[PDB]
């Protein structure tokens, strides 16, 4: 008796995002999505450490879903019989039944269909939440993604001006809790159930062993750097389902930032570093002004450099010497400025 | 020579709140409160772990005090002779003398009377702060609560519209640092002074053993779930005197959120998760739209599920299938969608 | 071919700030600064613990630089041949080349000259970032400071009213990771290179051993308390290059707070406690209303009291009994209020 047109969406693997309109003249639709749970061993760092991951659609994070305010979102959640555990889904975008968790619990060999109305604009976390201690364990094993609910007129600056992005990337940040043996080496297991007891002990001390973007250390560096061009406005959606993060674009800014992630609120302008509260998604727009490599980090630099939480942008274009220039390349310290140099000595 | 009418307030135990007006036509009053310090052993988790608590009025958190802008707050602080330590009180709502700490130090067998003018609107932490290392130790032993200073016209949305709550709950979140023996079992002591040295060692590593609402794991679940009804606007005041928190209402939202807690600032709209900075109180309004169980957590889900930080709301009313429905209950995965399902495989 | 007037600035050691105008009728200038790297052993706590620090200009934090929107900032970075490591500088205020890091790498015996345009208003972190794991290690060894880019019309309240400070202080907060031996005693080293391996192990567990203002526990207490007078509007700039903080002025407030630190955004009013995201600077204005000692802390009170993170203000002036008074000094609890006292018993 919901009498609206239906539109299948084909999801794509992060950090990319399925095709969508920003501003739309379409009316409300039933937007149809499918998520398939996959339990699998995955490589999470550059030394080849593995862990028993649980995922939506085989990725950490799960894929970004994009709809408009007033759409209905009809999600088929599938739990293949090759899986070992029950799973469900909780949309922070949705109203009632623990975000849908209380209507989507499925055993291996089952699927369920949930519909929720997109009444709240912004970027939102979705995650598995089967009950009790299994809630944090499924989330920190990788069962979390995000959904974006755009206003039908697209983004604005909170002051009556339209904002349009040229490109969008979804950065899902994952805190991982990998057990170690007595010598400090990471431990391997043959199933998620076998890893559980040792993993819960690490989780209880609230200190991750790894903090990664797109599921592994180095996943968005080198060959898999994020592309952009000088002049492009880029939307960077950042989610963290369990733990705080402080995003920073090294050599850039957040031109417009919704750090609490909700487009009914005006964005902040010109941030250096923003804050994604654990259990949320946020978003930053930036118009690139300079070519070159840009690191995108959480600005706990220990987590960024030593636990896995660095992505790169490779930006093509021409250098602007008015914004920044090397006036003098590295040279020998004269003599002759010794007394000057002071001085604190 | 302060020539105003006096009004006694009788405090009640959290999560409930003493009777008060939102909007008032009363002028400034001297609002009279009494807090009695109680040192006592308390049960803090579902396994019956005890710890040597220090409290205002026998509860963690201490009770919520409610006054209006321009009121004077006259607090009698009592330290019974059955107590073993000195105590005092610091109101983050108050101006001068370290929030009142420097005027309220009392030994067992003494009481003191402090008056502060409510010049700043919002929700604010109060806590004990006797000096030096005793400041964190008294606070993380449970000596903290909150005070709400309402505007005389009540709450508003920052855009000229009145906001009224039907119900108010005060959620005090407490980080606890319980010593363990060599086998990992929690240790018991005969007095707070005996527990101190071992507790300070845990405190120094900044990782709590427990994170609890209303003083213990499970304190606001089951029989003591928070009641509401569909259509009610509920104000949820959240305080944390020592450590950050990220509140989330599972299956709901924050319709209007003052996460820094101060009603001179417009609230944010439609949040999924908000952020209570350690040493502050914040507040969220929500109008319930769906019946059923709602979990209220800090969205570090490890802390929520495994260290004690989950409350429940039980909401009566009729389900709205337009907002959310189970389109198809759990069923067998057909065959026939195998190739479809993809695909990431 | 940049055809503007040049103005040398002489930096001063924090928490003080070089002379500058708030509002200015000067046009854009090339503002010339010099920073000299100094590696040196420094005392970081009241027990005389030492560590192998790395600094800009011999201080933690490095000094505050102040310029106006549209100025060009020309920084000579010097790495004396007595140093052992390469260094560079990344301005979060600057656009391109990793904030300048990619144009300023210098070996001992070298200097480099970088120019960046001050296109973004606010307070911003600067820090060393030589590459890879050396980025967090140089930052948490003390190589970080801040730059303030004022609007040419000075500060405003976001609602068309000018804000002017009488005094400015720069509080740089530093998380330190000092290795311990098997007995728990802090370890000493003859060089930063010798300290590195043991320090990286502490860094990896994300729990600092010390959290200090102006480079050491007690650095802004006693003789070095910050001075003010009743009626003065004081700007308190707070930076943290690697880790979150939650500033609080005990017995005061933040009258106007830019916790994300960027003056294109209206400040929040009347905060109790604010939040400096790791990798950022923020700023709070406060007009002192009461004389006496004020503690300024991070409101993790364990970090404030037990790990080093307390500063003091000593404020001269006359006490205002309307704002706060001790109605009755500590006295014997009567008898006769026993039944009253209740009650929770
Ligand atoms: O009381 C609401 C509670 O029930 C759930 C089932 O988990 O949703 C249902 O609500 C009613 C059952 O008592 C029915 O009217 C409805 O058919 C059903 O979806 C939860 O969503 C909610 O928490
Ligand atoms: O971190 C403890 C200790 O363990 C060792 C191996 O015994 O390294 C492990 O931990 C390192 C830090 O996480 C990893 O780099 C490595 O993959 C892992 O085996 C030691 O090298 C280290 O001292
Ligand atoms: O200098 C203010 C300082 O004193 C206190 C006492 O702890 O308040 C007092 O201030 C004056 C004492 O020098 C008196 O005028 C007043 O009677 C008294 O309350 C503190 O509140 C403050 O930090
Ligand atoms: O956590 C360490 C280790 O200690 C034991 C008892 O030896 O359990 C203790 O710690 C648990 C986690 O906090 C608690 O659930 C329990 O109350 C406590 O005794 C072991 O069971 C555990 O492996
Ligand atoms: O592609 C930009 C990249 O180069 C740097 C050098 O580290 O800046 C340079 O940019 C160009 C070199 O390809 C030149 O036009 C320019 O002379 C030079 O400064 C970085 O700043 C940037 O990341
Ligand atoms: O904290 C561990 C343990 O080590 C000792 C010395 O063995 O103290 C060290 O650690 C203390 C806390 O950081 C410091 O106060 C002191 O400078 C340091 O030597 C013990 O006293 C303590 O139990
Ligand atoms: O400038 N960021 O590390
Ligand atoms: O949806 N919260 O765990
Ligand atoms: O009131 N601050 O600890
Ligand atoms: Cu799951
Ligand atoms: Cu959630
Ligand atoms: Cu006390
Ligand atoms: Cu306080
Ligand atoms: Cu360096
Ligand atoms: Cu940086």
From TrEMBL, chains A, B, C:
Cu(2+) 1 binds at residues 87, 128, 138, 143. Cu(2+) 2 binds at residues 90, 92, 127, 299. This is Copper-containing Nitrite reductase (NO-forming) nirK. Its EC number is 1.7.2.1. It comes from the Bacteria. It comes from Bradyrhizobium sp. (strain ORS 375). Keywords: Metal-binding, Oxidoreductase. It is an enzyme of class 1 (oxidoreductase).
